[PDB]
């Protein structure tokens, strides 16, 4: 079943309970059974329309006999219609099979751009590359002053302006927006 | 993106990433190949008379017909890259052959000259001129080939 | 430099060609600019430098021939455009408002009828951003927008 399974517009059995968008994602942040994926560089809610576009575009563009795709995100559950909150850094759709990045990246980037938040088609190699170059940036930055240092030390009384979550986001996350160039 | 507090904006600006700046710009600072090698080495001894032409103006069918007419004799036509042919000249000690193989080159290795009939065939096509060659380590110009033919 | 002469019969003759000056300050440099220590030390008005990479009718010379870096070729091209627009190359022409540091071709810029508010003003570009890293002897950096 290489194609993405159809999801439901609303859950059959509505659950009770368990922001949900701000900050880095803690779940499904790493590859599992695949080599390519849609990385969510921002936070947002996924509607059934978004999911349907994911599914249709991926299924039609994808080669079933050489590529398989899997949902790395649950079905819409939060009522409003139903939505699936997604945090920055979470993989939305994963793909494997006997194909290559250059092969899948076209339609993966198309669907990523149609997603409701900043998204990027990323392979395992490119995910590792971006992580390593972010590490290199924070290692070689010539600015003596970093958001982490200033916030943690409360220099200038800056916690009067920063949020408590800022001491962990380190300036790389603001609202639902993940600033990737922020070091 | 919702507008930040001005103090937070100042914080972000002061903490912006600053890449290292090198003092001087680095840019402004300072087995098919071996198969062809052995094949050409062997051919240089197997062949006794060698000529070269520019069989690139011909069509597929015309080139095939020329190949048929050549195979009617023992002569064999060969194509090899000039990039790998240039070292072969100095390797085999053919200094006078350097200014002969440039652009498209088609060798005509043989041991028995049917050059008379080959020139007759070339005559009905007023192009594809014969080029200089070197039979048995003796460079021959086109006039030399004509004299040898006659 | 080869020139084609006709008489019809036409033939090409190679004439005298200048040679690089002896004793470059920085031998073993990537481009001529680096070899002569001019990486960030020339401007649009340095016609003596610029004209050495210019066709007789004002066109630029190709990078492959000039040997310049990619960035240095871009800088020289922009500086030459600015010099032509400023009239500093009266002899290099295809066959009256004084200007200088004109980034855009005069015929391709529309008037700024509605300059935005103070926080979103529409500014008039001056000079070229390619020369942003030129050696600055002034306390303030070059203002590329006015």
């Amino acid at each position: 079943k290489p194609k993405l399974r159809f999801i439901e517009r609303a859950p059959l059995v509505p659950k009770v309970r368990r922001s949900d968008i701000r900050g880095p994602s803690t779940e499904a942040t790493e590859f599992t059974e695949g080599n390519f994926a849609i990385l969510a560089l921002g936070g947002g809610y996924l509607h059934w329309g978004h999911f349907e576009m994911m599914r249709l575009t991926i299924n039609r563009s994808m080669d079933p006999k050489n590529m398989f795709a899997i949902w790395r995100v649950p079905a819409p559950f939060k009522p409003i219609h139903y939505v699936t909150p997604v945090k920055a850094g979470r993989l939305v759709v994963e793909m494997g099979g006997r194909c290559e990045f250059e092969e899948v990246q076209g339609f993966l980037d198309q669907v990523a751009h149609k997603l409701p938040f900043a998204a990027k088609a990323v392979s395992r190699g490119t995910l590792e590359k971006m992580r390593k170059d972010q590490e290199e940036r924070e290692r070689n930055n010539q600015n003596p002053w970093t958001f982490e240092r200033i916030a943690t030390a409360n220099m200038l009384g800056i916690r009067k302006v920063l949020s408590p979550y800022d001491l962990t986001h380190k300036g790389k996350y603001w609202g639902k927006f993940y600033m990737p160039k922020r070091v | 993106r919702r507008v930040m507090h001005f103090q937070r904006q100042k914080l972000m600006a002061v903490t912006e990433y600053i890449p290292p700046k090198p003092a001087i710009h680095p840019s402004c600072l300072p087995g098919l190949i071996r198969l062809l090698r052995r094949e050409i080495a062997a051919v240089f001894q197997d062949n006794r008379m060698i000529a070269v032409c520019q069989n690139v103006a011909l069509s597929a069918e015309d080139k095939l017909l020329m190949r048929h007419q050549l195979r009617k004799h023992k002569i064999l036509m060969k194509v090899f890259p000039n990039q790998v042919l240039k070292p072969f000249l100095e390797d085999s000690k053919y200094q006078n052959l350097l200014p002969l193989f440039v652009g498209h080159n088609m060798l005509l290795v043989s041991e028995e000259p049917k050059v008379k009939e080959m020139v007759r065939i070339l005559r009905t096509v007023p192009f594809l001129p014969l080029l200089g060659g070197c039979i048995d380590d003796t460079i021959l110009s086109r006039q030399g080939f004509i004299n040898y033919s006659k | 430099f080869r020139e084609v002469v006709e008489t019809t019969i036409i033939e090409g003759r190679i004439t005298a060609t200048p040679k690089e000056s002896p004793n470059p300050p920085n031998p073993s440099g990537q481009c001529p600019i680096c070899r002569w220590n001019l990486k960030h030390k020339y401007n649009y008005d340095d016609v003596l430098l610029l004209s050495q990479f210019i066709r007789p009718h004002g066109g630029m010379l190709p990078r492959k021939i000039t040997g310049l870096c990619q960035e240095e070729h871009r800088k020289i091209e922009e500086c030459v455009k600015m010099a032509h627009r400023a009239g500093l190359l009266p002899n290099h022409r295809p066959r009256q408002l004084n200007r200088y540091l004109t980034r855009w071709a005069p015929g391709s810029v529309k008037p700024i009828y509605k300059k935005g508010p103070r926080w979103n003003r529409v500014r008039m570009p001056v000079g070229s951003p390619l020369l942003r890293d030129n050696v600055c002897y002034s306390r303030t950096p070059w203002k590329l927008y006015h």
């Binding site: 002053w145 030390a153 220099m155 200038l156 | 507008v3 904006q9 100042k10 914080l11 | 926080w119 979103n120």
Partner: peptide
């Protein structure tokens, strides 16, 4: 209306940060 940070403001903040870093050092012992 948006506001923007000037080089002078950045330098003022950096000067204050340097003073505070020296304060950290002198309090560390």
């Amino acid at each position: 209306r948006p506001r923007f940070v000037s080089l002078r403001a950045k330098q003022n903040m950096i000067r204050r940060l340097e003073i505070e870093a020296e304060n950290h050092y002198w309090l560390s012992m």
